[PDB]
Amino acid sequence: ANIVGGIEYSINNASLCSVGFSVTRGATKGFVTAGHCGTVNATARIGGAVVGTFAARVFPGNDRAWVSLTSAQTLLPRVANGSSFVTVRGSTEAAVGAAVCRSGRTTGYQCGTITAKNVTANYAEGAVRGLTQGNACAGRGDSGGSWITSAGQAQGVMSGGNVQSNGNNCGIPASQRSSLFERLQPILSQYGLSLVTG
Amino acid sequence: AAPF
Numbered sequence: 001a002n003i004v005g006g007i008e009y010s011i012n013n014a015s016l017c018s019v020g021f022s023v024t025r026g027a028t029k030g031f032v033t034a035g036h037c038g039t040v041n042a043t044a045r046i047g048g049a050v051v052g053t054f055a056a057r058v059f060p061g062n063d064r065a066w067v068s069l070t071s072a073q074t075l076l077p078r079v080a081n082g083s084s085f086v087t088v089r090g091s092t093e094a095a096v097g098a099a100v101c102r103s104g105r106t107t108g109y110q111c112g113t114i115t116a117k118n119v120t121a122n123y124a125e126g127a128v129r130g131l132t133q134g135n136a137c138a139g140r141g142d143s144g145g146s147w148i149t150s151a152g153q154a155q156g157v158m159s160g161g162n163v164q165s166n167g168n169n170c171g172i173p174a175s176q177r178s179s180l181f182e183r184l185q186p187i188l189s190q191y192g193l194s195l196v197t198g
Numbered sequence: 199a200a201p202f
Contacts, residue, residue, distance in 0.1 A: 007200055017202075024199055034201070063201070122199070124200070138202070141202065159201065160199050160200050161202075162199055178199060
């Protein structure tokens with residue numbers, strides 16, 4: 001499969017999440033995603049084909065994971081935006097007030113701004129600390145997806161937010177949305193990963 | 199908030 005930020009993948013033929021970013025670990029291919037999407041050694045499938053397994057994750061506390069892929073997978077420096085793509089250029093962290101977009105299989109590509117950093121989400125499983133909050137909307141299924149500036153600087157992976165009964169927070173005004181993402185830089189250093197760029 |  002071609003590995004692109006924002007596309008769907010299933011975990012153990014049950015849950016769905018979105019790919020965050022193509023990364024390498026030496027000769028090994030992978031993509032980073034959210035920790036709550038799978039446990040270590042769970043099977044990832046894209047289009048009904050096995051592409052790799054969860055290699056490591058931390059959830060709750062943090063919310064991060066990387067999936068190691070078989071070598072038949074094609075890593076690409078891109079994030080889906082409808083039929084078009086945003087090139088991943090690096091991972092400079094943007095400040096509060098910066099505009100940012102995110103990509104996932106449920107709501108597609110949505111943009112907004114970063115409103116706060118170092119937010120704690122108190123999920124049923126336990127707290128996840130150190131999350132950045134943006135007000136781009138998102139929905140169930142978007143977890144693990146890319147947050148990136150249009151200049152191609154990769155920001156993080158979707159963790160969670162304030163869902164309404166329709167399964168997303170797109171029908172409530174931006175001022176009222178809390179869409180939380182896990183910062184990419186600590187995931188890269190923690191697992192020794194390098195971002196694929198173009 | 200909930201995960202996603």
